Amino acid sequence: IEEQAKTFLDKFNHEAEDLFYQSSLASWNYNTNITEENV
Description:
Elements: H1 2-11, H2 17-28
PDB class: membrane protein
Keywords: ACE2-B0AT1 complex, membrane protein
Entry title: ACE2-B0AT1 complex, open conformation
């Protein structure tokens, strides 16, 4: 349960190294220009 808390707070990362960073690399491109579509 505690490991299943540890690993699900580590395997959600397998759903979200992309779904953070490919939203966070996408958080970046708001800032090179006056473009809001990025925000």
